[PDB]
Amino acid sequence: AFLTVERMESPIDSADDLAKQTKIEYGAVEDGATMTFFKKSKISTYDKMWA
Amino acid sequence: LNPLSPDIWMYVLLACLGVSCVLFVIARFSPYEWYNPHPCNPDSDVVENNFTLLNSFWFGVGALMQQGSELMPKALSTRIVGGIWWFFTLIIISSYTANLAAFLTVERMESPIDSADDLAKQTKIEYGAVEDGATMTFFKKSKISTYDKMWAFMSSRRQSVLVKSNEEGIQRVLTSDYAFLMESTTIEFVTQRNCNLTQIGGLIDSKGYGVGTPMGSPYRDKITIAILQLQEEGKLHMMKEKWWRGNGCPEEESKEASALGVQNIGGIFIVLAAGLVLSVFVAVGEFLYKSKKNAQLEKRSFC
Amino acid sequence: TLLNSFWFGVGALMQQGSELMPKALSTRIVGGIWWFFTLIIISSYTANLAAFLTVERMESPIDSADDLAKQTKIEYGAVEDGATMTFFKKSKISTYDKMWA
Amino acid sequence: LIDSKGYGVGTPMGSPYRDKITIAILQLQEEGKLHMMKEKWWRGNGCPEEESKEASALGVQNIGGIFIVLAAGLVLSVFVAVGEFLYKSKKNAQLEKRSFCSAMVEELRMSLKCQ
Amino acid sequence: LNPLSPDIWMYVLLACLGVSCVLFVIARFSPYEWYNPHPCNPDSDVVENNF
Numbered sequence: 001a002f003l004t005v006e007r008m009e010s011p012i013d014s015a016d017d018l019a020k021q022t023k024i025e026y027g028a029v030e031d032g033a034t035m036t037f038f039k040k041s042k043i044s045t046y047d048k049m050w051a
Numbered sequence: 052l053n054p055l056s057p058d059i060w061m062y063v064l065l066a067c068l069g070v071s072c073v074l075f076v077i078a079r080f081s082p083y084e085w086y087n088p089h090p091c092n093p094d095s096d097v098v099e100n101n102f103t104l105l106n107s108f109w110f111g112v113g114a115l116m117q118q119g120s121e122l123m124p125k126a127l128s129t130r131i132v133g134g135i136w137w138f139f140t141l142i143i144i145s146s147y148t149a150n151l152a153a154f155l156t157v158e159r160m161e162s163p164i165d166s167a168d169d170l171a172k173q174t175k176i177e178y179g180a181v182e183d184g185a186t187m188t189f190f191k192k193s194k195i196s197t198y199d200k201m202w203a204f205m206s207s208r209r210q211s212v213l214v215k216s217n218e219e220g221i222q223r224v225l226t227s228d229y230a231f232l233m234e235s236t237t238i239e240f241v242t243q244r245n246c247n248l249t250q251i252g253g254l255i256d257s258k259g260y261g262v263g264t265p266m267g268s269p270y271r272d273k274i275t276i277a278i279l280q281l282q283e284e285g286k287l288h289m290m291k292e293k294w295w296r297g298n299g300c301p302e303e304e305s306k307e308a309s310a311l312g313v314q315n316i317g318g319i320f321i322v323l324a325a326g327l328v329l330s331v332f333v334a335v336g337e338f339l340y341k342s343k344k345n346a347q348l349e350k351r352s353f354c
Numbered sequence: 355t356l357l358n359s360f361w362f363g364v365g366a367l368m369q370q371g372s373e374l375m376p377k378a379l380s381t382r383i384v385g386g387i388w389w390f391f392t393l394i395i396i397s398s399y400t401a402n403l404a405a406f407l408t409v410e411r412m413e414s415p416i417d418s419a420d421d422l423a424k425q426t427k428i429e430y431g432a433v434e435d436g437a438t439m440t441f442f443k444k445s446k447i448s449t450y451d452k453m454w455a
Numbered sequence: 456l457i458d459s460k461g462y463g464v465g466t467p468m469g470s471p472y473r474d475k476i477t478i479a480i481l482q483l484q485e486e487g488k489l490h491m492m493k494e495k496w497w498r499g500n501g502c503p504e505e506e507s508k509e510a511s512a513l514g515v516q517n518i519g520g521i522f523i524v525l526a527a528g529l530v531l532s533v534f535v536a537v538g539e540f541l542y543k544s545k546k547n548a549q550l551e552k553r554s555f556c557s558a559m560v561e562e563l564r565m566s567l568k569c570q
Numbered sequence: 571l572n573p574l575s576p577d578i579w580m581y582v583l584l585a586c587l588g589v590s591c592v593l594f595v596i597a598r599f600s601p602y603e604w605y606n607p608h609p610c611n612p613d614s615d616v617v618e619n620n621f
């Protein structure tokens with residue numbers, strides 16, 4: 001029950017997997033072209049990253 | 052033999068000869084193991100230590116495989132061997148049942164190849180490409196790198212790695228062992244409805260598609276203000292998510308994890324078959340040894 | 355005897371012990387390899403009956419509308435062209451748009 | 456790749472300098488030139504790393520410490536093998552008449568084979 | 571030595587010495603566990619324990 005717990009877990013590999021990780025805080029360059037894509041996105045996976 | 056990473060299989064085997072042979076040294080040097088195997092009398096001067104080198108391996112192997120042995124030592128210097136070699140067993144045998152429980156319920160299929168470079172070293176995979184399309188014009192003019200060496204593959208074995216269309220090769224890779232070099236827009240389309248065929252590697256080339264326009268037009272200054280408008284609102288991405296979606300394959304179920312057959316473990320019907328034949332050969336091998344002794348005992352040797 | 359040779363054939367496979375305990379080298383390998391045949395089979399049994407009862411405990415029946423969206427085996431079903439599909443065709447929640455797909 | 460922006464050789468307010476470049480930059484894009492130069496400044500150390508994963512497939516890194524306690528469990532066997540050998544030699548020297556010279560004779564007796 | 575906490579391993583070894591000593595007391599105190607280990611020539615008054 002240890003070696004099947006740390007086998008179910010895996011490092012994040014995409015942008016939706018990081019949305020389910022509220023422990024790891026996001027970080028970005030502020031008020032630039034990166035947040036420009038994220039504030040007007042209606043995909044609602046990246047809107048969760050904006051939240 | 053998979054769940055213990057064979058450094059440990061070589062260390063335990065070199066510890067099953069290690070602690071075994073030291074227990075031979077400790078016993079013959081200790082006084083209490085010099086007791087009588089015939090305790091009916093006080094002594095007939097028949098006082099003899101039981102631990103021979105054949106019996107020294109026997110408490111080694113017999114304790115490592117949970118079945119026990121016949122010796123079960125008496126002297127305190129041979130209890131400390133018997134108190135640690137037993138505790139050496141209940142972690143190795145209780146990590147074997149731990150890992151093999153954790154490899155059957157949670158499996159992750161490792162691919163042998165991960166890129167165009169790790170794929171390049173193994174010539175047993177029979178790469179192939181789509182002959183006379185847009186891909187062969189990339190590798191023909193390729194004088195760059197690794198991809199030049201892959202051109203020497205395809206020129207050596209033509210009409211077998213040069214499938215005439217996309218659809219015939221998808222039938223071919225579903226049967227044979229094959230690995231495409233084709234467009235990464237169609238690969239995103241095939242892998243969503245035919246979920247046995249994943250995209251390993253990544254981008255090697257970036258041509259990029261585009262709306263056509265005749266030679267000289269005021270359209271193209273207003274086409275690009277419409278395409279770049281659709282990139283920013285995500286409409287060009289939401290339409291890309293809409294058509295290439297299809298069915299989708301959330302394939303994680305683990306599939307009743309495994310009804311374990313011969314296909315996983317069959318080597319213990321091989322190491323059993325290669326064990327009993329080894330003992331028939333030593334049965335005749337010591338049968339001649341008794342005849343070798345009887346050659347020296349009475350008078351006669353071979354008759 | 356053959357009556358006792360099953361006893362080392364059965365008792366060594368069920369880990370309860372034996373009564374013979376062979377005493378010479380030509381019967382130490384057969385006495386030794388058969389012990390290694392037991393400890394792989396019995397530890398591919400305990401290590402696999404654990405692997406059934408933790409698989410059908412991770413799975414659970416669907417309890418919401420997003421969990422059924424991840425189940426492409428169970429096909430949806432609805433009343434056709436009515437008030438139910440009216441809510442689903444104009445939804446922009448994109449969880450119910452996946453149910454419309 | 457979330458977004459697909461793309462860089463570009465810029466061109467001033469509406470001018471035919473875009474037309475001589477969009478022709479000529481596609482010759483660099485298709486032959487080899489934007490891969491021969493991209494691997495000339497984005498090269499780096501070429502660092503190999505991690506052998507990617509062992510990932511709970513137990514080796515020496517986790518249960519290797521029992522080979523410490525198996526090594527430590529045999530050191531306490533040798534040091535007590537002297538202790539049993541000194542305990543009866545102290546007893547047998549008390550019995551008949553003689554001193555610790557016979558304790559070496561007890562080693563001369565127990566150095567023999569199966570008796 | 572991780573899947574049991576350091577409170578169990580400290581108590582298991584203190585339950586090993588707790589049952590090695592109590593079984594030593596009961597086996598001497600009990601009448602039946604006194605027996606002669608010589609039935610090859612019985613009735614010898616050579617009563618000894620394995621304990």
Ligand SMILES: CCCCCCCC/C=C/CCCCCCCC(=O)O[C@@H](COC(=O)CCCCCCCCCCCCCCC)COP(=O)([O-])OCC[N+](C)(C)C
Pocket residue numbers: 131134135523524527528529531583586587
């Ligand atoms: C029924 C009787 C049961 C007795 C069980 C006793 C179990 C004792 C448990 C005590 C619990 C105390 C908690 C902490 C102890 C740490 C132990 C450890 O991990 O390894 C320690 C040593 O290893 C040993 O302690 C010796 C074990 C081998 C010999 C045991 C023979 C038993 C015979 C019984 C006859 C009586 C003789 C023994 C009397 C004790 C040190 O390891 P380390 O420091 O990490 O090494 C790295 C050092 N470095 C970093 C510089 C490289």
Ligand SMILES: CCCCCCCC/C=C\CCCCCCCC(=O)O[C@@H](COC(=O)CCCCCCCCCCCCCCC)COP(=O)([O-])OCC[N+](C)(C)C
Pocket residue numbers: 061067321322325326329383387
């Ligand atoms: C004895 C120590 C253990 C074995 C030694 C190795 C340890 C060294 C560590 C690492 C090196 C390992 C690499 C060796 C490769 C050689 C080929 C090989 O042997 O495997 C072959 C057979 O397997 C056997 O026959 C060996 C096991 C049975 C004989 C030994 C035990 C018998 C009693 C012992 C008497 C002494 C008592 C000792 C007491 C301690 C594999 O079979 P195959 O035909 O290739 O099947 C392939 C099928 N496939 C293609 C689908 C995949």
Ligand SMILES: CCCCCCCC/C=C\CCCCCCCC(=O)O[C@@H](COC(=O)CCCCCCCCCCCCCCC)COP(=O)([O-])OCC[N+](C)(C)C
Pocket residue numbers: 103104105106329332333335336337340377378379
């Ligand atoms: C692929 C095919 C390959 C196979 C076929 C190849 C074809 C070739 C054909 C034929 C060749 C094969 C010949 C058979 C070999 C053994 C014969 C035998 O049994 O006699 C002896 C060896 O048996 C033992 O017990 C081993 C240990 C010896 C005990 C002490 C003697 C000296 C120890 C030093 C060296 C030891 C080893 C050192 C490290 C290696 C019997 O010994 P024992 O004293 O009577 O046993 C007492 C048992 N007791 C304790 C119950 C009382």
Ligand SMILES: CCCCCCCC/C=C\CCCCCCCC(=O)O[C@@H](COC(=O)CCCCCCCCCCCCCCC)COP(=O)([O-])OCC[N+](C)(C)C
Pocket residue numbers: 357360361364367395399
């Ligand atoms: C763990 C230890 C390993 C070996 C264990 C022993 C060997 C293996 C024994 C039998 C092999 C089984 C044949 C394979 C068929 C598989 C089908 C099945 O599941 O059960 C079948 C057999 O049911 C039994 O097995 C009953 C148990 C046998 C008891 C005798 C063993 C004691 C030996 C000691 C005696 C001492 C001798 C004297 C000594 C001196 C019938 O069940 P079913 O009708 O098919 O149900 C289907 C349900 N389903 C569709 C949902 C699946």
Ligand SMILES: CCCCCCCC/C=C\CCCCCCCC(=O)O[C@@H](COC(=O)CCCCCCCCCCCCCCC)COP(=O)([O-])OCC[N+](C)(C)C
Pocket residue numbers: 052053057060061063064067108112115143144147322382383385386387390393
């Ligand atoms: C939990 C139990 C505790 C420890 C047990 C004892 C410790 C030592 C045990 C095993 C040591 C193994 C060392 C290396 C590991 C194998 C690697 C290998 O390449 O094997 C190969 C050859 O090797 C063989 O075929 C031999 C199989 C090993 C079993 C030995 C049984 C002898 C019993 C010992 C006692 C006898 C009693 C005698 C009494 C006097 C076979 O595999 P492959 O062809 O490479 O398959 C390729 C597939 N793959 C790539 C995914 C792998």
Ligand SMILES: CCCCCCCC/C=C\CCCCCCCC(=O)O[C@@H](COC(=O)CCCCCCCCCCCCCCC)COP(=O)([O-])OCC[N+](C)(C)C
Pocket residue numbers: 062065066069070073515519520522523525526527529530533
């Ligand atoms: C004369 C008496 C008998 C002695 C011999 C008995 C015969 C049979 C004995 C053993 C047979 C089988 C084992 C041998 C295999 C190699 C061991 C190994 O794997 O290394 C392990 C030891 O871990 C360390 O190296 C950490 C530092 C250890 C310092 C000294 C330990 C002694 C502890 C105090 C001693 C006093 C205790 C006192 C308590 C009161 C782990 O290695 P690693 O560093 O983590 O990395 C792997 C490196 N490698 C790949 C090269 C392995």
Ligand SMILES: CCCCCCCC/C=C\CCCCCCCC(=O)O[C@@H](COC(=O)CCCCCCCCCCCCCCC)COP(=O)([O-])OCC[N+](C)(C)C
Pocket residue numbers: 083127531534535538539542
């Ligand atoms: C790193 C350096 C090394 C570590 C230093 C280690 C320090 C020294 C280590 C161990 C001390 C002794 C070592 C040599 C003697 C062997 C022991 C023995 O045989 O037991 C004897 C008890 O002892 C007696 O003879 C009766 C007196 C009781 C002593 C205390 C109780 C023993 C508890 C546990 C012992 C201590 C446990 C540990 C305590 C902390 C058995 O009685 P016997 O009289 O032999 O039987 C009749 C003899 N006859 C059959 C031939 C007729």
Ligand SMILES: CCCCCCCC/C=C\CCCCCCCC(=O)O[C@@H](COC(=O)CCCCCCCCCCCCCCC)COP(=O)([O-])OCC[N+](C)(C)C
Pocket residue numbers: 581584585588589592
């Ligand atoms: C001649 C000799 C006779 C005795 C044999 C001696 C050898 C073997 C004896 C014990 C084995 C090892 C000793 C310590 C471990 C015991 C439990 C422990 O962990 O401590 C306990 C503290 O309880 C105490 O503090 C009492 C300490 C007195 C020792 C004997 C008490 C038990 C007997 C009378 C028993 C009466 C019970 C009712 C019976 C029907 C901790 O509590 P817990 O229980 O572990 O967890 C429950 C609490 N919780 C749920 C909130 C977490």
Ligand SMILES: *[C@@H]1O[C@H](CO)[C@@H](O[C@@H]2O[C@H](CO)[C@@H](O)[C@H](O)[C@H]2NC(C)=O)[C@H](O)[C@H]1NC(C)=O
Pocket residue numbers: 225226227228
């Ligand atoms: C599991 O994947 C393997 C991949 O190797 C499949 O094995 C191939 O099966 C086809 C049958 O159409 C053979 O022509 C190939 O030669 C096999 N490849 C080999 C042996 O390397 C296997 O069919 C798949 N199983 C299932 C149930 O999908």
Ligand SMILES: *[C@@H]1O[C@H](CO)[C@@H](O[C@@H]2O[C@H](CO)[C@@H](O)[C@H](O)[C@H]2NC(C)=O)[C@H](O)[C@H]1NC(C)=O
Pocket residue numbers: 225226245246247
């Ligand atoms: C490889 O392709 C698929 C992937 O498992 C297997 O067949 C598919 O099965 C799924 C359901 O699991 C269906 O939705 C697909 O339509 C099936 N596709 C095809 C082409 O049959 C197929 O059995 C696998 N193995 C081989 C040898 O082709």
Ligand code: NA
Pocket residue numbers: 001148149152153400401404405
């Ligand atoms: Na388990």
Ligand code: NA
Pocket residue numbers: 117118369370371
């Ligand atoms: Na057992």
Ligand code: NA
Pocket residue numbers: 118119120370371372
């Ligand atoms: Na037993």
Ligand code: NA
Pocket residue numbers: 148400
């Ligand atoms: Na078990």
